RNA sequence: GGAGCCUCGGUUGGCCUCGGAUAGCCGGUCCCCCGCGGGGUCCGGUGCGGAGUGCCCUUCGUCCUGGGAAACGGGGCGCGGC
RNA sequence: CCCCGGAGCCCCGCGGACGCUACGCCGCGACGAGUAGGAGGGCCGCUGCGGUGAGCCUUGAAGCCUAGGGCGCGGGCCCGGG
RNA sequence: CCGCGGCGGUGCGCCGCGACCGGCUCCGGGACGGCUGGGAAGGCCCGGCGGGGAAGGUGGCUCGGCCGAGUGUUACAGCCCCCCCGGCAGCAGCACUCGCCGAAUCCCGGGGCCGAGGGAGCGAGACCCGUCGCCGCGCUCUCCCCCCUCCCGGCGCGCCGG
């Protein structure tokens, strides 16, 4: 068998450890969440500067 | 397609190394005004350093032994040769690209000639250090034709002064011509300072 | 109607001091002197172009005396803008300190 | 000492090592840990049944 | 035949879950309580005296070679060129100007039209200015210059596709041996449909490029590297 | 002017002050001295050098016709003299 | 709730390779400096004998030569021309 | 013979492309954790409390046009600086890159290079072939609705019905 390395090959990772699916479903969503909240903070800082 | 360098003001070894690599990469190099090359460390230092080199000779038949070239051009050529693989074919080929002259003769006198600022004395030495002109050194070690080279360079410098004067006068006419014409070149001249010249 | 290839010189093979690995040329590209100014040229096609006694074929042309050895600038080599190349046949040694054309045309521009 | 470098590895370090370069000694044959079936087959008598358990 | 109930988050990772999906598809309430010899398989025909004959479709072969190669191993994720996914450098947007680097139209400038089905670029250096017709090219042998005509509302013909811009001639046998056979034929003739298409596309393009001053001149010119100018340094 | 072996490298040019460096470059001299220039003083400009090699020059499709701005410039390996 | 001379087959216990010169074939790991010295395998090589190739050979054997074509890690070998 | 139909091996010679995997080497984004629950900083300013250099000051002298410049002395604050009390949201290892260590507290996208090396179908009336494990999904055998609209159909480019 060819050893495909898990840390690149998502579906090899899942086959070894299927909980990685969820751990990476979270920490995209969590990061996207936090990016949004940063943009809103920045907008609020811009609004405060304009005021 | 040909580097012409003004050997004046340059450091003997420092210019040589830069010339050597260029010559190895197929660039044809001309070094000119070699007597003006000047070497770090005081004059007496370097005289003794040359006079040692002169002592090195093949005891049994000096006619074979190390050929001590006196001419500054040939000195420079020698030190450049030291930074090539000059026993090989490629090393020899490379040496044959190089061309070196005491003073500045007629093909190169009417050519703008570059300066290696990495080998330049003003840059590379501290101003409180001493150095030797490779003309004097050559003169005192045997070189015959310092005086002749000097006189020819006066004539060359006089002839060059004229050329410069005429170049200046043209540049002056160009500047006046632009002022004469600056309404019928206005919307060309405008675009040549949107894209960032003339400023 | 003009030149569509950047000028470069064939500096010599990839080599330690005393072992030369003839399967990996070194290329000094003109005007580029940093392991920085060289991301442009990575993966670019490059030709050593040299003519010889006997005639050959020529794509889209009548037979000619010119021949080329094709290659490919693989990666940058050491700080001062030198680059490594790899040619479908190794380079002659005759060829040192001569022109090799680096093309533009696996462009990422 | 002068023949080794060593220290206290991270969690990440343990994960990287095992996943990227994890090979099980299986009938004395160095074999890559491509599936749990291998780890379980050898270590399953210890409540170790997947790569994660090995890391743990 | 609904579309995909969870969207894509990353290649291979859905936005939702198992359990979130169970809820959306609704596996609750969608529960499915469900608890040769004589007769010949596939031959059959007619025919006169004696009776009707039983033929055989796909009859066993009349020769076997002395040895033959033995299958392969399936291999998972190799698709044919047709089924591939096609890319494009962001630099190339429709109506941008290119420098076509490779062919006979070498260093000529050009107006990019559309990415074809192949993944080639369709291109026109309006035949009138540049002498470069409606023509395919490759992303890779092309420099995407930062100069864009606004080509938005030109109806490029639907019928002009990858298939049409494709070389035509030459079949197998004929007289063959001697000093003849398809060394002649000689010329790719242009055809009239091709000229009409060029006409139709160029008329729509050309007026837009004449709205940008000097641009027709630029497109007339050819690209080349001169002394003291280095691709890495300059921009396009 | 025609063919025809062979040897190859190349794949825009740069037609020039001198030099200085704890300094330089350009102007203009109203004014003075020397042989259109050279030297001086004085003044006015530049000086991380735009009268910049980080530069300058040159353009890179061919033709047609029918307008504008620019316009006597280019050629005939055009021809004789200084 | 039935029979493979017919389930149509990813498993088939009814019969079994394209494979099986079992001194064969196939799969996984690991490893590979070497004098003196030891051991193994040589479809490496020389000469002669018992067998054997319904072998080859004046329509040209051996030997010799070969900028001819090939094989083998190698000892070597095979083909073409003379 | 024309089909280049389906399968199998191939390419005369030189080439190029594409996507998939393996191994690399780089690039660009973003999201977090900890600390002297970071240190400094910024911004707003207010009330105090001292100390220092040394000043819109004064003074001897000097240099230029009462003013500007240069030294010198005692030193308050009308140039600052420093300590001490008390209090504000703007911080955030901060793109005002001043100084870390990291990642189940971590992810995404992109570029260059080298490589593909194996082959679970040799049945006589029914495949010359899939595919194992993993992801999920996606879909369907459940009904709903909404949108956009590609093909086609209808009506007035617009609207309505795969
Ligand atoms: Mg003598
Ligand atoms: Mg040529
Ligand atoms: Mg051994």
Swiss-Prot record, chain A:
Superkingdom of origin: Eukaryota
Residue numbers carrying N6-acetyllysine: 21
Location of cross-link Glycyl lysine isopeptide (Lys-Gly) (interchain with G-Cter in SUMO2): 15
PTM note: Citrullinated by PADI4.
Record's subcellular location: Cytoplasm
Assembly with partners or alone: Component of the large ribosomal subunit. May bind IPO9 with low affinity. Interacts with RBM3.
Function: Component of the large ribosomal subunit. The ribosome is a large ribonucleoprotein complex responsible for the synthesis of proteins in the cell.
Family as reported in the entry's similarity comment: Belongs to the universal ribosomal protein uL4 family.
Protein name listed in UniProt: Large ribosomal subunit protein uL4
Lineage, broadest ranks: Eukaryota, Metazoa, Chordata, Craniata, Vertebrata
Shown chain mapped onto the complete sequence: 313 to 360 of 413
From Swiss-Prot, chain C:
PROSITE patterns tied to this protein: RIBOSOMAL_L35AE
Record localization: Cytoplasm
The organism's place on the tree of life at top rank: Eukaryota
Protein name, per record: Large ribosomal subunit protein eL33
Alphabetized InterPro entries for the sequence: Ribosomal_eL33, Ribosomal_eL33_CS, Ribosomal_eL33_sf, Transl_B-barrel_sf
Keyword Nucleus: no
Lineage, uppermost ranks: Eukaryota, Metazoa, Chordata, Craniata, Vertebrata
Subunit structure: Component of the large ribosomal subunit.
Gene Ontology MF terms: structural constituent of ribosome; tRNA binding
Positions carrying N6-acetyllysine: 7, 62
GO cellular component: cytosolic large ribosomal subunit; synapse
This protein's encoding gene: RPL35A
């Amino acid at each position: 068998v060819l050893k495909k390395n898990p840390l690149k090959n998502l579906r090899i990772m899942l086959k070894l450890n299927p909980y990685a699916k969820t751990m990476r479903r979270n920490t995209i969503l969590r990061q996207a969440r936090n990016h949004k909240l940063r943009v809103e903070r920045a907008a609020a800082a811009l609004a405060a500067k304009s005021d | 397609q040909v580097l012409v360098l003004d050997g004046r003001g340059h450091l003997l070894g420092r210019l040589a190394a830069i010339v050597a690599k260029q010559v190895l990469l197929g660039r044809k190099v001309v070094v000119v005004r070699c007597e003006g090359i000047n070497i770090s460390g005081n004059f007496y230092r370097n005289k003794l350093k040359y006079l040692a080199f002169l002592r090195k000779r093949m005891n049994t038949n000096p006619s074979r032994g190390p050929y001590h070239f006196r001419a500054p051009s040939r000195i420079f050529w020698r030190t450049v040769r030291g930074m090539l693989p000059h026993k090989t074919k490629r090393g020899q080929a490379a040496l044959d690209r190089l061309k070196v002259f005491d003073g500045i003769p007629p093909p190169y006198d009417k050519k703008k000639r570059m300066v290696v600022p990495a080998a330049l004395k003003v840059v590379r030495l501290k101003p409180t250090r001493k150095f030797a002109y490779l003309g004097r050194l050559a003169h005192e070690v045997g070189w015959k034709y310092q005086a002749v080279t000097a006189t020819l360079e006066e004539k060359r410098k006089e002839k060059a002064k004229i050329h410069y004067r005429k170049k200046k006068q043209l540049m002056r006419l160009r500047k006046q011509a632009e002022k004469n014409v600056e309404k019928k070149i206005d919307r060309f001249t405008e675009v040549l300072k949107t894209h960032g010249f003339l400023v | 109607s003009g030149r569509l290839w950047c000028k470069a010189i064939f500096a010599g093979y990839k080599r330690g001091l005393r072992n030369q690995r003839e399967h990996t040329a070194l290329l000094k590209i003109e005007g580029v002197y940093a392991r920085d100014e060289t991301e442009f040229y990575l993966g670019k096609r490059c030709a050593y172009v040299y003519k010889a006694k006997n005639n050959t074929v020529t794509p889209g042309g009548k037979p000619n005396k010119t021949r080329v050895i094709w290659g490919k600038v693989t990666r940058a080599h050491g700080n001062s803008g030198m680059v490594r190349a790899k040619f479908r046949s190794n380079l002659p040694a005759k060829a040192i300190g001569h022109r090799i054309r680096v093309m533009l045309y696996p462009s990422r521009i | 000492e002068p023949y080794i470098a060593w220290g206290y590895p991270n969690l990440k370090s343990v994960n990287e090592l095992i996943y990227k370069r994890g090979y099980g000694k299986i009938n004395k044959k160095r074999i890559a840990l491509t599936d749990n079936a291998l780890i379980a087959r050898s270590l399953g008598k210890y409540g170790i049944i997947c790569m994660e358990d090995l890391i743990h | 035949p609904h579309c995909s109930r969870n969207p894509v988050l990353v290649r291979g990772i859905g936005r939702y879950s198992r359990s979130a999906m169970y809820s959306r598809k609704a596996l609750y309430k969608r529960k499915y309580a469900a608890p040769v010899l004589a007769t010949v398989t596939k031959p059959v025909g007619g025919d006169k005296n004696g009776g009707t004959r039983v033929v055989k479709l796909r009859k066993m072969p009349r020769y076997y070679p002395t040895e033959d190669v033995p299958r392969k191993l399936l291999s998972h994720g190799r698709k044919p060129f047709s089924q591939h996914v096609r890319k494009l450098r962001a630099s190339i947007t429709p109506g941008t100007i290119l420098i076509i680097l490779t062919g006979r139209h070498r260093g000529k400038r050009v107006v990019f039209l559309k990415q074809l089905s192949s993944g080639l670029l369709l291109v026109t250096g309006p035949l009138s200015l540049n002498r470069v017709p409606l023509r395919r090219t490759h992303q890779k042998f092309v420099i995407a210059t930062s100069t864009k005509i606004d080509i938005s509302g030109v109806k490029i013909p639907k019928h002009l596709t990858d298939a049409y811009f494709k070389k035509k001639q030459l079949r197998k046998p004929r007289h063959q041996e001697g000093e003849i056979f398809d060394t002649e034929k000689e010329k790719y003739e242009i055809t009239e449909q091709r000229k009409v298409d060029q006409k139709a596309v160029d008329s729509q393009i050309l007026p837009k490029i004449k709205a940008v001053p000097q641009l027709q001149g630029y497109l007339r010119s050819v690209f080349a590297l001169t002394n003291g100018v280095y691709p890495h340094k300059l921009v396009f």
